[PDB]
Amino acid sequence: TKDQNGTWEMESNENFEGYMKALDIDFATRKIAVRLTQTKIIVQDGDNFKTKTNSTFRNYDLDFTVGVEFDEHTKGLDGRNVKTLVTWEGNTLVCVQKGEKENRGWKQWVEGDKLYLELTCGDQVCRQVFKKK
Ligand SMILES: CC1=C(/C=C/C(C)=C/C=C/C(C)=C/C=O)C(C)(C)CCC1
């Protein structure tokens, strides 16, 4: 369990193109997406999270309560319907997205004033680091 509240500015993004490719996102959207800075805003009131991942092209907003399974519609990404559950494994927030894609989900944790995010889909891992502003 840990405080992840804040505005976080991207400082690193490794193999985002491989992750988008495992999601079958098209060539044109990917080439534009891989070059953009992302900012993440997170408001955390206990077990309720409101998140926004912004970039000039397109944004992605995801709200959820820890430990309550829900239906996520990945609109603006691959636009699939997945069954999502986010839980705490120590101070990593762990998300599994059950559906057609194998091994799909993410892990998010803080160290110092950096937010680390690991995104998985199939055999592809994408590593991102953001710094709190
Ligand atoms: C593919 C893609 C995007 C990235 C989406 C990601 C991967 C969202 C992650 C959300 C999570 C993990 C939030 C938890 O803190 C953008 C930048 C919207 C632009 C359009 C294409």
UniProtKB/Swiss-Prot annotation:
Pfam families: Lipocalin. It comes from the Eukaryota. SUPFAM superfamilies: Lipocalins (SSF50814). One of its GO terms (cellular component) is cytosol. GO terms for molecular function: fatty acid binding; lipid binding; retinal binding; retinol binding. GO terms for biological process: fatty acid transport; retinoid metabolic process; retinol metabolic process. It is found in: Cytoplasm. All-trans-retinol binds at residues 40, 108. Its main location: cytoplasm. Keywords: Cytoplasm, Retinol-binding, Transport, Vitamin A. InterPro entries: Calycin, Fatty_acid-bd, ILBP, Lipocln_cytosolic_FA-bd_dom. Forms a beta-barrel structure that accommodates hydrophobic ligands in its interior. Intracellular transport of retinol. Belongs to the calycin superfamily. Fatty-acid binding protein (FABP) family. This is Retinol-binding protein 2. It comes from Rattus norvegicus (Rat). The gene is Rbp2.
